[PDB]
Ligand binder design. Structure first.
Ligand SMILES: [Mg+2]
Lengths: 296, 296
């Protein structure tokens, strides 16, 4: 199977006067490349994909593909939907803008059954010939892709090579790799990056990496090189920021942190997303001070 | 405040050969009118709003508005989105198509904060001049509209007149009506229709009403007349069908039941929604036998 693994960043989408800041998006991705990141994830949840137009999502994918041209860094484009016909179209459009693969979230709100999840992802996998990484985050979607459904999709469709697990369920990650050790388990939960990698996970799709790409990159590569003492040391050190980056719902804290570090020019969200409370604002600012934040 | 209350039906959307069966859709709405239903809800979650096109969603609202002209039945159109710019647009389009009000689900998947939820609904309420009913279903959206957020929205915005509670939280229903008794609490959970109405709820937006509109109609109006002994008797008798209609995710059981009762001609869903398991198919068939199902 063709795979996209390693240290990956769920890119924020900076806004300036209500429009997508193309420069800063481009300058932010080059910062990730410069700090050891293996792949970038445009227009995901951390990129506020719910409030982007198809034209804005297509510009962000094109910016990601062009900024990582001539480098080993891949583009794992977010192309998911709770409607299978749309998810197929988003998959085809991401392949056409030059993405090396797609991260397609489980259908949200309409809560499909396991049978429906299988047919949903099977239709996506047979629509394109590029890798497809499953994304299971039940707290946001209301749905859970069972391990049996994940394993069946991995074995029955060739483009599906693994799953992004943001469920806070290390038991399920053992279940996945004990019954299907060839799949690519990817961490979607920054605080438990090392425990997932220590069980055989082959990468992370991080929110923290937006602010500290060098540390998340080093963590992933330490663990993949079986240097668990250094991977756990970085994981322990990132715990405070990994948690505080979820004081409010992602990407509200991480965008606030990028603004506080001067990495973006505006602290603008699109509704229903909003700036955090003064209380959480001070908490993010105070937690950032204990970390060395790389510039441009 | 202008309100839309009473027995209301979350309409299913019948499909035939992958297209919206417009004739059958109109004949299902007229069946609801003839059985005492006070309002119809097009393009809701039970209508598979996630997999409908905007042109298809506009056809369903127009069919509902046209079928309810010359009658007392109002059209509470589904017009929600996890993007406020879209939810505002859907609100404006539903009123322009003749809808008496809109049912606006809480933003799903992207999990806005309470502050974000307030601005989301405030932006929707100030966009149209028709009543707006909040919709809180945390199991599907991943977010919860707090009691304080609902009460603030009810008092600060005039189109907002209440909330459709699908929370399994009779404590919260006491919380809402004890601190703000002027709002219109609507039951979004069929099995607990009577307890919500008996505490001061003024209506239901029902899934069972698709199959048994006369019993949901009689239940609600018995309760509104404080004939609680008869309202509870219908609620107790409906408990078996109210639960079995959620053995799988709504609207999979209700569409299965409508097909089994011959009220819709084809049992078609749009992916990721699918036909139910053969076991649950038999269970739905077995529960229907003990109820008197009205025809056309
Ligand atoms: Mg359900």
């Amino acid at each position: 199977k063709n795979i996209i693994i390693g240290a990956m960043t769920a890119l924020i989408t900076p806004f300036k006067n209500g429009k997508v800041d193309e420069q800063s998006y481009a300058r932010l991705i080059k910062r990730q490349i410069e700090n050891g990141i293996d792949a970038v994830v445009p227009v995901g949840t951390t990129g506020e994909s719910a409030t982007l137009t198809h034209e804005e999502a297509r510009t962000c994918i094109e910016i990601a593909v062009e900024t990582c041209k001539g480098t080993k860094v891949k583009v794992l484009a977010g192309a998911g939907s709770n409607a299978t016909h749309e998810a197929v179209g988003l998959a085809k459009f991401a392949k056409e803008h030059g993405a090396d693969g797609i991260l397609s979230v489980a259908p949200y709100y309409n809560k499909p059954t396991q049978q429906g999840l299988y047919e949903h992802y099977k239709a996506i996998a047979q629509s394109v010939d590029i890798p497809v990484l499953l994304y299971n985050v039940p707290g946001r979607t209301g749905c859970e892709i069972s391990t049996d459904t994940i394993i069946k999709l991995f074995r029955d469709c060739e483009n599906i090579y693994g799953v992004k697990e943001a469920s806070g369920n290390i038991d399920k990650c053992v279940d996945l790799l004990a019954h299907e050790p060839r799949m690519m388990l990817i961490s979607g939960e920054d605080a438990i990056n090392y425990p997932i990698l220590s069980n055989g996970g082959k990468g992370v799709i991080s929110v923290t990496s937006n602010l500290l790409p060098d540390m998340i990159s080093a963590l992933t590569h330490f663990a993949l090189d079986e240097n668990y003492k250094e991977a756990k040391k970085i994981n322990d050190e990132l715990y405070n920021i990994n948690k505080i980056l979820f004081c409010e719902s992602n990407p509200i804290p991480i965008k606030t942190a990028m603004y506080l570090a001067g990495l973006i020019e505006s602290l603008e969200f699109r509704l229903p997303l909003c700036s955090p409370s003064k209380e959480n604002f001070a908490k993010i600012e105070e937690v950032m001070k204990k970390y060395k934040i790389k510039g441009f």
